[PDB]
């Protein structure tokens, strides 16, 4: 089998700049039969199937911007992206398109670097309809922040919580290169009705000092 090795594993670039990534094959992909290098590049953006970018090492698929350039020969191939755009956020895969079995590289993850952006912080009390079912989920939303690093702490009447919250983070946004984060605190109806203040405490670089969003039970 032809082993495809991609490097770097990942990289972080500022929009507008140039990126270069490499794809090596364990055996030559050059057909001495016609002088074509049968190497294919794909872009896979978040939540989407892979998209064909380049084939025969250097030919762009119709519709693909000219700032994507494939180069190389034999066993050493390069994808170059000039003037990188926020929407170029993706994992890029190369593929042996020469001989069976067809094989893929492990991918190069392209991440975007941008100016620091502080999260907008929102808090949601549990719904009346969930409370009826005997459970209370309190949601804290951190919206549109950069960089990814963030700390969210739940406080219930000034007491720090542990083991009763779960956290989810989106992939970088294709337009503004930010992340969003949800933190859900879950307790029983009975345990919820034992307390007054439900607070979400947020630490991030875009914040000079940690931010607290809170409500009193029953207030909303």
């Amino acid at each position: 089998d032809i082993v495809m090795t991609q490097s770097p594993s990942s990289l972080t670039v500022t929009a507008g700049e140039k990126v270069t990534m490499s794809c090596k094959s364990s055996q030559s992909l050059l057909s001495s039969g016609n002088q074509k290098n049968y190497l294919t590049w794909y872009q896979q953006i978040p939540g989407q199937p892979p998209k064909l970018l380049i084939y025969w090492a250097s030919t762009r698929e119709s519709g693909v911007p000219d700032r994507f350039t494939g180069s190389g020969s034999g066993t050493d191939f390069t994808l170059t992206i000039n003037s990188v755009q926020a929407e170029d956020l993706a994992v890029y895969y190369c593929q042996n398109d020469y001989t069976y079995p067809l094989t893929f590289g492990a991918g190069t993850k392209l991440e975007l670097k941008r100016t620091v952006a502080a999260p907008s912080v929102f808090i949601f009390p549990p719904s009346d309809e969930q409370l009826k079912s005997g459970t209370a989920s309190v949601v804290c939303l951190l919206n549109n922040f950069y960089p990814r690093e963030a700390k969210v702490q739940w406080k219930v009447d000034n007491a720090l919580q542990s083991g009763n919250s779960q956290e989810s983070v989106t992939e970088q946004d294709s337009k503004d290169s930010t992340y969003s984060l949800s933190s859900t605190l879950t307790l029983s109806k009975a345990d919820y009705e034992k307390h007054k203040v439900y607070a979400c405490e947020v630490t991030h670089q875009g914040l000079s000092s940690p931010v607290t969003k809170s409500f009193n039970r029953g207030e909303c």
Binding site: P50, Y55, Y93, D97, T103, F122, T184
Partner: protein, 229 residues
Amino acid sequence: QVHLQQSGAELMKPGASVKISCKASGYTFITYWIEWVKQRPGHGLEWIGDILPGSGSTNYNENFKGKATFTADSSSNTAYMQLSSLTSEDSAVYYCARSGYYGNSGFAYWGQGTLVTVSAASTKGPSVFPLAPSSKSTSGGTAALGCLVKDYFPEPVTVSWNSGALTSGVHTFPAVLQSSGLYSLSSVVTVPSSSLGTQTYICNVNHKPSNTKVDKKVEPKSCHHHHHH
């Protein structure tokens, strides 16, 4: 235009089988190879094999010999992949794709992918709760609202807003597996706080594996401290 339409997400128990379909349109079905690709997180793309419909010719990744079986019916323009003796390692998104117009020119068209879950756990529809917009989810005139989609199995669920008319500022979070073994996620959206009284906001939640469709109207709430007047 060329289109590949795959069958819906599936749950099957360990040791059983699953069959995924890939319906082709907009081209001559027997002219092009149908490719099958496996994707699990942390394992990039993995080539399973291919078939040229009408010819019976197949090619395998030898690691899938004894696991995957390819067929195609030229009459219905449909390719199939069956996966046998399922294990948790077979849990993944599976794509079909079509070979290129020009020859050895990449997989130019892709199906949307089919999520396969291999688990003993039973199917369960989600509960859908509103995340109401209020002064606690308002900053500088922009208001956050959403729906919490809780306690379902297996993945995936889809969430849309106002039947697809509202896409700006939507964030649908990756599902988290709760300790219970059920999934939970939230879908949120930011909007001007002034439209809260005049615009209706509805999250459309679909969990196809359990045939659950919920349209949840998200109503604004008012906030006030508990005091006597």
